[PDB]
Amino acid sequence: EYQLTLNWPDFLERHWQKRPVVLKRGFNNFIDPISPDELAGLAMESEVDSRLVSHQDGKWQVSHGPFESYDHLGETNWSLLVQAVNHWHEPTAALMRPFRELPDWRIDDLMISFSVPGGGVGPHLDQYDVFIIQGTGRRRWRVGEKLLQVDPFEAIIDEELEPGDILYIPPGFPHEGYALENAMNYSVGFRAPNTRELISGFADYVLQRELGGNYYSDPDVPPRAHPADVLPQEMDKLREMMLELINQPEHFKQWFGEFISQSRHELDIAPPEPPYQPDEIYDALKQGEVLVRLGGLRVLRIGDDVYANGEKIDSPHRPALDALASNIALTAENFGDALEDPSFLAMLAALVNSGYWFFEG
């Protein structure tokens, strides 16, 4: 397992969502989980979101994958960036574990860039927190003060990253990175909803479930000098209906569990055929087999319920469920007596048959 040398309370107190910082030797003896060639290969696949970025003579150029080849690209001034490699490559997903000191619901995916000297995407800022882990090679990273693609900035951090160095950047800090030597960078990205996404999502939920069917009612309709007027008390009442629908706590929790447990990038969903019967799940677990969560699959506990990729999961076996949320790899011990409950077993079978968890690989 990858192991951070970070002082976490320090980082949280001084840097998280406050100030960028180079974590020198964040990882000791850093070994890359994937090679440039493997990355390129991955970028050859259609299910994978990737891009190639180039710059020559002052002018940029972006291409989107999949790429049939790379036959002629150049020695310098380009970079291949692949989103969510952790959805497609397990060793890569291992890089994200140490960052579980921060909450799962806030973590996004892992983006990998390979760059030849000069390669990079130019000066910009992002709306999300990011840890950029330096793998093989070397890159110059610059970060300016809080103000996509921005004007040139005066740097407050200007560093050459070495294998195992990590650059943390809060949202809104302009930054710029380019390779000095053939370089792999691993961006553990975070994600945070905005209010627009929240109200949109919740509205979709309410439409789908046919909730909020209560009509404005006015047996005490107020008088007005002008019949076309809409009075502030009526407005206040309608507004209050809206707020009240939002404050129905159980519905709020269910909607948010479904909303937030969805991923921002395509998952490698491969439903088993033929489907698993509950008995197979039982037997396999009892025989000591490991149930593995699909890479990038979001699984979060909200109250007593667990939410996996948009689906709610409810069971009177609390520790087993919590095991589903916390553990990437699972064994019979994690579930305990819950495996004797056939309703629970059928639930696990449904999850596996959806391709959300798989045995061993």
Q: Does 339 bind ligand AKG (CB under 6 A)?
A: no
Residues 6+ apart with CB under 8 A from 353: 271, 272, 275, 276
Q: Does 113 bind ligand AKG (CB under 6 A)?
A: yes
Q: Does 250 bind a second copy (CB under 8 A)?
A: no
Binder of residue 194, out of Co ion, ligand AKG, a second copy, none (CB less than 5 to 8 A by kind): a second copy
Instruction: Choose between 35 and 248: whose C-beta lies nearer to ligand AKG.
Output: 35
Stretch that binds a second copy, among 47-55, 154-162, 293-301, 351-359 (CB under 8 A): 293-301
Count the site residues for a second copy by CB under 8 A.
66
Residue 321 corresponds to which tokens in the numbers above?
């469920």
Smallest gap from Cβ 124 to ligand AKG, in A, equals 6
Residue 251 corresponds to which tokens in the numbers above?
């519905």
Instruction: Choose between 326 and 353: whose C-beta lies nearer to a second copy.
Output: 326
Cα–Cα distance for residue pair 191/264, rounded to 1 Å? 9
Tokens 């180079």 label which residue?
A: 22
Residues 6+ apart with CB under 8 A from 142: 153, 155, 157, 158, 159, 175, 176, 177
Consult the annotation and say whether 126 binds a ligand: yes
Q: Is 272 helix (H, G, I), strand (E, B) or coil?
A: coil
Q: Does 98 bind ligand AKG (CB under 6 A)?
A: no
Consult the annotation and say whether 300 binds a ligand: no
Judged by CB under 6 A, which of 117, 120, 164, 174 binds ligand AKG? 120
Judged by CB under 8 A, which of 3, 63, 149, 200 binds a second copy? 200
Judged by CB under 6 A, which of 95, 121, 321, 324 binds ligand AKG? 121
Cα–Cα distance for residue pair 240/217, rounded to 1 Å? 12
Sign of the dihedral defined by the CA atoms of residues 35, 38, 44, 46, in that order: negative
Q: Does 239 bind a second copy (CB under 8 A)?
A: yes
* DSSP codes joined into one string, 17-43: TT--EEETTSBTT---SS-HHHHHHHH
Nearest to 136 by CA among 107, 95, 165, 102: 165
Consult the annotation and say whether 125 binds a ligand: yes
Nearest to 321 by CA among 308, 335, 340: 335
Stretch that binds a second copy, among 51-59, 94-102, 274-282, 343-351 (CB under 8 A): 94-102
Consult the annotation and say whether 139 binds a ligand: yes
Cα–Cα distance for residue pair 293/305, rounded to 1 Å? 18
Which pairing describes strands 155-161 and 175-181: parallel, antiparallel, or unpaired?
A: unpaired
Stretch that binds ligand AKG, among 18-26, 43-51, 120-128, 348-356 (CB under 6 A): 120-128
Instruction: Choose between 69 and 214: whose C-beta lies nearer to a second copy.
Output: 214
Q: Does 86 bind ligand AKG (CB under 6 A)?
A: no
Cα–Cα distance for residue pair 304/248, rounded to 1 Å? 17
Q: Helices 342-353 and 278-286 sit at what angle, rounded to 10 degrees?
A: 100
Instruction: Choose between 175 and 317: whose C-beta lies nearer to Co ion.
Output: 175
Judged by CB under 5 A, which of 38, 104, 126, 322 binds Co ion? 126
* Site of interaction with ligand AKG (CB under 6 A): 79, 113, 120-121, 126, 175, 177, 185, 187
* Site of interaction with a second copy (CB under 8 A): 12, 16-18, 100-106, 127, 171, 192-200, 202-203, 206-207, 210-219, 221, 224, 226-230, 234-235, 238-239, 241-247, 252-253, 256-257, 260, 299-302, 322, 325-326
Residues within the annotated binding site for substrate?
A: 113, 124-126, 139, 175
